[PDB]
Design a binder for this molecule. Structure first.
Ligand SMILES: *[C@@](C)(CO)[C@](*)(O)[C@H](Cc1ccccc1)NC(=O)[C@H](Cc1ccc(OC)cc1)NC(=O)[C@@H](C)NC(=O)CN1CCOCC1
Ligand SMILES: *[C@@](C)(CO)[C@](*)(O)[C@H](Cc1ccccc1)NC(=O)[C@H](Cc1ccc(OC)cc1)NC(=O)[C@@H](C)NC(=O)CN1CCOCC1
Ligand SMILES: [Mg+2]
Ligand SMILES: [Mg+2]
Ligand SMILES: [Mg+2]
Ligand SMILES: [Mg+2]
Ligand SMILES: [Mg+2]
Lengths: 196, 211, 222, 233, 195, 226, 204, 195, 196
């Protein structure tokens, strides 16, 4: 898996590959790893698909109930619900989740929640097996307050390299753009990103 | 440890060593492995010292409550069974306790062997611990029902000595008890070092050992 | 896998006099080959003229002492400020230890004080609750180094009276507090030389009818 | 029972004449990966206590929240919450030590090593250590992990025993701490150049320094070192 | 414990059980009676893990005695054996199963027939003319297969039983210290004091 | 053990503590860990004590024979090469961890050596259980262009750090200084900061205290004439 | 299972003024079972004494081996071997079995016939020499012996005083070890006379 | 195999060895002689792992017989015992050690003294007045410690030996099928045919 | 460890960090991982220091003997000797070696020899624990026929990122330049490369 979330001037963009493996067999080559827990709060999932689906479903339930009572929740609040689940059930879970969301007050925010259940707020985050191969690239090429088009290129180039070197990553590159304008889904096929 | 106890014409003898170990290290030279439950009830101890002390002192609580409720001393048979039932609750939990419940009741003198498995055996003679085989050798060849109190006390004393000598994990001293229908009678602490040389000379035994 | 136990080293020593008692322990606290503290008190005045030391795994030792101190406090509340005798404290501690028969306090405990006849008393425990009153006891890391020395110098074992040649033993004459403290200091100085976990400092608590008194002595810091 | 995932390395500290100093780097390691570079592992509790934590970061964040809630709870129905009945270093430590020992007794530990540094109401210096086993000890110098092996020897050259504390100034103590942090950066593979330092003084109060860097490093001699034995070029 | 044998003849059931009890490397007792009377015409012998055997037997005994008092009526050997089997089948899937094998020898006063039931610790019940537990059958069943008739007298049953014990005493590496023999018939239960 | 090696202006110095341990027990309070390979090549060993000795004596023997064969003074690189190839061959089963230092016609040298056969070069090194305590001192105080007196001070300070802070190290400090154009000076017990205090009591027994069974003269002399 | 503690036993050696002492218990066992109370663990090759603890078969084997080697040494050198030289021979012989060692704890004691200097030395099972000035200990009660020797010992003791010190060190250490005791022997060694004393001790 | 005992009296050495041989759960033989004559005045009994015992004993026997023929002279019991010990000490560090414990009973014709040597599979030799291997000593040594004198006659030695076997037969869980007893004295080796 | 070798217009450059670890302890912070087996044939070592030192010493012996008989050996020949040792003793070795050399005929060549003992000729190679973090960066930034100064910057930037993310890597960056001009050693200290 290769997943990342990047903040930029107008908000935040989540990115992911689409490969799901059972050993060396590709069980699904068009997976959607970008999952919605609220209107403008999305997460990227890594680790056990069963665990991360079960968590994201519970989180979506909590934020739906939160909204009914207290109005639109913050991205920090969503990350706290993820954390609480990932931390208290760390012995029985294998989940590496990146949470990304857009407020009008706080704008684009990114939280990463690795295996232990710790939370880390960041300008951008990378995770999954393929992330190891792009730590150097992403660190060198990331800038704060990039444009939408710059941020899309950054994620596309980054995940392109992750896919190139990681066998557990591949397929299409899916992206979700979170801004005041709304929610935009993007997709990029191999013939586009492989020639970068 | 080595412990023994046997029934005879004039009641029951109970003899134990006093050594305690923690690996090859001798942690104690003089430990009491007999519990005075009541004036007519004794309990020997072999195995884990903590298990032996806790459960036999808890037995004494339960034997005391029996007397208060019924206005009558508990039998040796009933006391031994209460203990064996305690062992059966913590069945497989890792307790290590080998004990002989000695006493005098209405049926006369009583002797029961009880271990951590919940085993409960009635008999005229028992010996427990790492050195029980050495004690049995002396007991089996010299035991009679027609023993005098003096000779019986010596037999249990000499049988422990045999074990203390050969068994590395038995020794220190010998504690003697004699149970009668008027209760038990303590016949003292006997240092094995001194007792060995004394028995060697008087009896002529342990010829192979030089002194 | 998580190991809930540890070894903080240290060594303790209890000696009972005719009308006094001492409980000594080194002040060094360690893990593996590192020193945590050169002065971490290990012997405590628990009240009612009783002193206590739980040597081995410090966390379990601190928990036991803390619980016993608590037991003394509640003994006063429940029984009209009655003094807890040393024999009653010993029995109470047995039940504190055996409450954990299947997840033991990993400590070798010693208490010292005076019995109800005013004579010196030392009680020794194992991690699971077996106890006994003794005249002399060393516990902990260097216990095997020190105990034989005390058998020889306190109970005069293997010592006979010259001229008789093994026929008459050395008589068991009582020891003064000054003579005992010498044996305590020499015991720990010897243990410090040959045992790596023993050193830094020595703290002695002396119990008499007048109360509990402390004495501190430096030890080698290597 | 668990295993630590995201970890923080050494926390070092020492007493000086008027207070205590504590320091810890800003790194959150993920095994051999130096994953997170902006992690604060010194957490102040009021204006008289700083809790330094090493080990598992998720458990650290949990402890951080317990302490934040402890301050909240202490203020409840307490007119003297910012005065006589304010939280003391000894209260905060004993609370943590209670929690750590309870968790290890349930075989579900908080995989941490904690040093509580502070100054009491009476001006006495407080410095005590507690870890995942519930083991507690106090000393003029305290350090966790690698700091125990490398920092303590250096800090004990300044304060070797209790009587050296009144002779040690804040400038000397801070200098020793900063030197120790440099040594750890040379020799601890799970350390970072960036660190935080906190001073709790009985007169000047709590001084919290962030974004400190290890400086004055010696590397020049490396140019002369060639091969592993016989190589000359 | 080790060897328990059973044989059903014309008008009685005979149970033979070893006398030895061993702890560690020492034989503590050579006169142990490995049996309990469940009712006047029903006897149960037992063998298995130390402690469990007596506890189980006495627990069964108490339950059958309770039934007898409640109904003022003796349960048939078949009914008792089924009750015992269920308890063992219940036990095998417990947290700590009772490791006990039993033979139930009874005389059914209604049908005027002796009955022998063999039940192992799993709750495996079989009605047999002769039975054994553990390794006992390996040595003895060939003799029983050869010599057994259903019209045998009690005396002939005892003679065939002696031959089985003699074979055990010859070919087993194990000294089981002889056997206590008990006979169950219309008149009740009695022990053969010389064997 | 704690052992160190420090280079300086015109040579190299090595130092060691003097404690040997059987687990938590101190077997020898004044052990000699500074071994001689050749007159001006000395090594100091940590790990399995018998292995550090045996491997040092073996290579020192072969170095001497080599020196005789070549009519030249032995080089530290020769000892280094012979040691590592020997240790590598036994794949870490010979638990010898050494700091090798010396002076030869090529100059002054300082190497460390691990049990599996890997070698390192440095201006300052430390090995053993107290290596971290010693290295903390070396990293704090070492500098380029040290003098002989500064290097001995730094070396012994590094050993002291191990003595006081490592339970596996203790007692005294041994030093050996190898300077270019000079005889190597072995300073046995250079520091003695751990002398046992006087005991409070004398435990000398009265003659006749011990019980005896038999006495006999032992014939240690050979068979006699006449 | 542990070869160094199957048979049990202890050896202790001490230096005095112009004298040395070496002592050993007499027990040989099979773990808990006491087998022999006459198993002496001290041997001598000329005026050099060797005490060996540990696995009894290796004790016997090594004695026979060093008897073999010292007898050849003497035939070729035309003189008895000295303690310092013998110590190196023991070390060499043990290390030649580095990866299949004798499970022993040898102790050398003797006086150099030329210099008159008292000498003692101890080894681990594979040859590491411990050349102590004061005392050497070996066996299943080595921890006990260290405690006794370290407290009872003082330098420059006369032969008849040294005897009492080493005897009490051994006896009281053995009485705190299950696998040691069953009798004891003490050798008092001077430059040209050696006395051997069997001690009276508890036989449990 | 299991039990081998030895006792040295005034003028002879007596060796008692069990007769049982067990394969699996079956006693194959109850008359096995666990001994070999090494020379006219030297007897060796043995016990240990199956097969190794006889192979080792016969190998020793062949070597001593070879020595006897070569020198026209009988080796002393001490010399034979040392040879045997060395072979076992050599064996314990071999690829597959011989798992054999032995007692060597001999009469030294030079010194006119009986001699008993106990050697275990490790090569642990001890000269004793009485000895045993395995668990045998646990039951018998207390009796021997009590009753043994060095001036005992051969008949008194046999009576004390009977008492040892009786104790073994009472307290061992193991049926070893009695013992074959052999006496070694100045006149050579003979078997006690009634025991 | 972080090691790399890069071919360029005038020849080849080897690069390496200087950190040697025993677990988390840095046993040596100024290690020289760039080792000479012949005048202009050098190697970068990764894996067991004992194994790689023993191998490089044997290889140096073979190439010294080769030279005495047959003249200057090729870089391919040197890589073949490494391979033969690494392949035939693969069960008892843990060695990841990069071989780099300069001929006048063949110019700069780079061979990598991973764990199994296979050989791979490449334009550039990266190896060691820290190499994982710069696969994306190095792939994106490498060009053929770079200048010396460009290649030095490429290695410096690459190893800077490897050091930044890998705890097993660090210290100084050592480099060895192999050209017709000769052999040039370079060194770059933390204060230089950390601020890149
Ligand atoms: C013989 C000595 C050994 O088999 C005998 O069984 C004694 C019996 C006994 C009974 C009551 C009091 C004292 C002794 N047993 C012991 O000494 C046991 C043996 C044993 C060791 C280890 C075990 O864990 C598997 C089980 C049994 N020793 C102990 O219980 C020992 C751990 N405790 C003590 O030594 C406690 N003492 C030490 C001195 O201070 C007072 C407490
Ligand atoms: C400090 C003590 C620890 O590193 C130092 O390295 C010394 C080095 C040393 C060198 C020359 C002379 C004396 C000391 N090492 C020791 O003191 C070692 C500690 C040690 C014990 C056991 C070992 O096996 C894993 C390795 C090291 N002492 C000894 O080696 C000596 C006392 N021998 C033994 O303890 C017996 N060893 C023999 C080999 O098998 C294991 C037990
Ligand atoms: Mg799951
Ligand atoms: Mg792919
Ligand atoms: Mg030290
Ligand atoms: Mg069945
Ligand atoms: Mg004994």
């Amino acid at each position: 898996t290769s997943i990342m979330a990047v903040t930029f001037k107008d908000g935040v963009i989540l990115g992911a590959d689409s490969r799901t493996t059972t050993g060396a067999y590709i069980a699904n080559r068009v997976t959607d790893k970008l999952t919605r827990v609220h209107d403008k709060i999305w997460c990227c999932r890594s680790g056990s698909a069963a665990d991360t689906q079960a968590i994201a479903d519970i989180v979506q339930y909590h934020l739906e109930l939160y909204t009914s009572q207290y109005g639109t929740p913050s991205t920090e609040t969503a990350a706290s619900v993820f954390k609480e689940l990932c931390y208290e059930n760390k012995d029985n879970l294998t989940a590496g989740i990146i949470v990304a969301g857009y407020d009008d007050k706080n704008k684009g925010e990114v939280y990463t929640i690795p295996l232990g259940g710790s939370v880390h707020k960041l300008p951008y985050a990378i995770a999954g097996s393929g992330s190891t191969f792009i730590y150097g690239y992403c660190d060198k090429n990331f800038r704060e307050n990039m444009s939408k088009e710059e941020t899309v290129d950054f994620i596309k180039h980054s995940l392109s390299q992750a896919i190139k070197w990681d066998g557990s990553s591949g397929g299409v590159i899916r992206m979700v753009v979170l801004t005041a304008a709304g929610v935009e889904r993007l997709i990029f096929y191999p013939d586009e990103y492989e020639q970068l | 440890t080595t412990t023994l106890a046997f029934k005879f014409q004039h009641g029951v003898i109970a003899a134990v060593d006093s050594r305690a170990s923690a690996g090859s290290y001798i942690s104690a030279l003089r430990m009491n492995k007999v519990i005075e439950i009541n004036p007519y009830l004794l309990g020997t101890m072999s195995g884990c010292a903590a298990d032996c002390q806790y459960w036999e002192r808890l037995l004494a609580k339960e034997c005391r409550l029996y007397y208060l409720r019924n206005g009558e001393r508990i039998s040796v048979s009933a006391a031994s069974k209460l203990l064996s039932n305690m062992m059966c609750q913590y069945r497989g939990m890792g307790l290590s306790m080998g004990s002989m419940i000695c006493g005098w009741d209405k049926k006369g003198p009583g002797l029961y062997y009880v271990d951590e498995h919940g085993t409960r055996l009635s008999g005229n003679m028992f010996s427990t611990g790492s050195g029980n085989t050495y004690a049995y050798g002396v007991l089996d060849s010299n035991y009679k029902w027609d023993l005098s109190v003096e000779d019986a006390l010596y037999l249990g004393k000499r049988s422990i000595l045999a074990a203390a000598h050969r068994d590395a994990y038995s020794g220190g001293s010998v504690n003697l008890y004699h149970v009668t229908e008027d209760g038990w009678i303590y016949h003292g602490n006997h240092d094995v070092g001194e007792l060995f040389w004394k028995v060697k000379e008087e009896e002529g035994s342990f010829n192979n050992v030089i002194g | 896998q998580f190991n809930p136990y540890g070894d903080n080293g240290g060594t303790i020593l209890g000696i009972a006099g005719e009308d006094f008692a001492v409980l000594a322990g080194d002040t060094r606290n360690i893990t593996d080959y590192s020193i945590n503290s050169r002065y971490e008190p290990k012997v405590f005045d628990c009240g009612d003229n009783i002193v206590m030391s739980a040597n081995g795994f410090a966390a379990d030792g601190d928990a036991l002492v803390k619980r016993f101190k608590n037991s003394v406090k509640w003994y006063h509340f429940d029984h009209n400020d009655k003094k807890l005798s040393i024999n009653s404290a010993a029995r109470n501690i047995q039940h504190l230890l055996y409450s954990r028969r299947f997840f033991p306090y990993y400590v070798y405990n010693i208490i010292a004080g005076l019995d109800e006849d005013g004579k010196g008393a030392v009680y020794s425990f194992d991690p699971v609750g077996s106890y006994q009153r003794e005249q002399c006891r060393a516990g902990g890391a260097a216990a095997s180094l020190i105990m034989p020395f005390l058998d020889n110098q306190v109970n005069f074992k293997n010592q006979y009276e010259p001229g008789t040649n093994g026929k008459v033993k050395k008589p068991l004459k009582y020891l003064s507090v000054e003579e005992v403290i010498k044996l305590v200091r020499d015991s720990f100085t010897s243990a410090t030389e040959r045992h790596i976990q023993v050193g830094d400092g020595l703290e002695i608590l002396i119990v008499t009818k007048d109360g509990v008194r402390k004495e501190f002595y430096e030890l080698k810091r290597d | 029972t668990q295993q630590p995932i995201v970890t923080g390395t050494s926390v070092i500290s020492m007493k000086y004449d008027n207070g205590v100093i504590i320091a810890a780097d800003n790194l959150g390691s993920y095994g051999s990966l130096l994953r997170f570079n902006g992690v604060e592992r010194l957490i102040p509790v009021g204006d008289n206590t700083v809790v330094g934590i090493s080990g598992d970061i998720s458990d650290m964040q949990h402890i951080e929240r317990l302490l934040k809630d402890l301050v909240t709870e202490n203020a409840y129905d307490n007119p003297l919450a910012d005065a006589e009945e304010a939280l003391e270093p000894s209260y905060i430590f004993e609370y943590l030590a209670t929690v750590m020992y309870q968790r290890r007794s349930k075989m579900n530990p908080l995989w941490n090593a904690i040093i509580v540094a502070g100054v009491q109401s009476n001006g006495d210096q407080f410095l005590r250590y507690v870890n995942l086993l519930g083991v507690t000890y106090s000393s003029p110098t305290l350090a966790t992990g690698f700091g125990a092996h490398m920092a303590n020897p250096l800090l004990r050259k300044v304060v070797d025993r209790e009587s050296d504390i009144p002779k040690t100034t804040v400038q000397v103590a801070e200098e020793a701490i900063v030197n120790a942090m440099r040594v750890l950066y040379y020799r601890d593979a799970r350390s970072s150049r960036n660190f935080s330092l906190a001073i709790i003084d009985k007169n000047t109060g709590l001084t919290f320094k962030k974004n400190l860097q290890v400086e004055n490093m010696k590397w020049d001699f490396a140019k002369d070192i060639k091969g592993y034995g016989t190589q000359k070029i | 414990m080790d060897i328990i044998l059973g044989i059903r003849v014309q008008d009685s059931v005979i149970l033979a059980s070893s006398k030895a009890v061993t702890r560690g490397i020492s034989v503590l007792k050579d006169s142990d009676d490995k049996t309990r009377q469940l009712s006047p015409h029903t006897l149960m012998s037992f063998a298995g893990e130390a402690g469990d055997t007596v506890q189980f037997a006495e627990y069964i005994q108490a339950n059958i005695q309770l039934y007898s008092i409640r109904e003022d009526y003796e349960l048939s050997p078949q009914a008792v054996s089924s009750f015992v089997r269920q308890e063992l089948a219940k036990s095998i899937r417990s947290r700590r199963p009772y490791q006990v094998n039993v033979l139930i020898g009874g005389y059914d006063k209604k049908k005027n027939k002796p009955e022998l039931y063999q039940i192992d610790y799993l709750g495996t019940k079989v009605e047999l003319p002769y039975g054994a537990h553990g390794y006992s059958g390996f040595y003895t069943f060939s003799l029983l297969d050869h010599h057994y008739r259903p019209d045998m007298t009690t005396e002939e049953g005892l003679d065939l039983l002696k031959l089985c014990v003699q074979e055990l005493e010859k070919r087993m590496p194990m000294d089981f210290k002889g056997v206590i023999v008990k006979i169950v018939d219309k008149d009740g239960i009695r022990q053969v004091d010389d064997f | 053990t704690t052992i160190v090696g420090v280079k300086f202006n015109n040579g190299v110095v090595i130092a060691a503590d003097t404690r040997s341990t059987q687990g938590p027990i101190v077997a020898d309070k004044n052990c000699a860990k500074l071994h001689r390979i050749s007159p001006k090549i000395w090594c100091a060993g940590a790990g399995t004590a018998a292995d550090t000795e045996a491997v040092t004596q073996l290579i020192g023997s072969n170095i001497e024979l080599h020196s005789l064969y070549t009519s030249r003074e032995p080089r530290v690189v020769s000892a280094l090469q012979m040691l590592k190839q020997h240790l590598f061959k036994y794949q870490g089963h010979i638990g010898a961890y050494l700091i090798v230092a010396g002076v030869d016609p090529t100059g002054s040298h300082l190497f460390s050596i691990h049990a599996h056969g890997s070698t390192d070069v440095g201006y300052y090194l430390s090995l053993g259980s107290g290596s971290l305590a010693a290295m903390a001192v070396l990293e704090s105080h070492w500098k380029q262009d040290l003098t002989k007196e500064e290097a001995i001070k730094l070396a012994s300070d590094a050993i002291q750090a191990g003595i006081w802070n490592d339970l596996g190290s203790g007692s005294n400090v041994d030093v050996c200084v190898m300077e270019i154009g000079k005889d190597a000076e072995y300073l046995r017990n250079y520091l003695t900061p751990n002398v046992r205090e006087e005991k409070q009591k004398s435990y000398k027994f009265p003659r006749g205290t011990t019980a005896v069974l038999k006495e006999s003269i032992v014939n240690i002399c050979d068979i006699q004439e006449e | 299972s542990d070869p160094s503690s199957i048979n049990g036993g202890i050896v202790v050696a001490m230096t005095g003024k112009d004298c040395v002492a070496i002592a050993c218990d007499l027990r040989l066992g099979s773990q808990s079972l006491g087998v022999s109370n006459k198993f002496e663990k001290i041997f001598h090759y000329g005026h050099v004494f060797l005490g060996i603890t540990g696995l009894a078969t290796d004790v016997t084997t090594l004695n026979e081996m060093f008897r073999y080697k010292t007898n050849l040494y003497k035939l070729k050198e035309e003189r008895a071997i000295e303690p310092e030289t013998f110590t190196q021979l023991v070390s060499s012989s043990l290390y030649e079995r580095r990866f299949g060692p004798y499970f022993v704890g040898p102790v050398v004691a003797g006086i150099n016939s030329k210099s008159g200097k008292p000498f003692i030395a101890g080894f681990d099972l594979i040859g590491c020499i411990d050349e102590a000035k004061d005392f050497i200990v070996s066996g299943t009660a080595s921890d006990q012996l260290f405690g006794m020797c370290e407290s009872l010992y003082e330098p420059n003791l006369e032969p008849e005083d040294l005897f009492e010190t080493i005897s009490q060190a051994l006896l009281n250490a053995a009485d705190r070890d299950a696998l040691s005791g069953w009798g004891a022997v003490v050798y008092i060694i001077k430059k040209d006379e050696v006395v051997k004393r069997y001690l009276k001790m508890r036989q449990d």
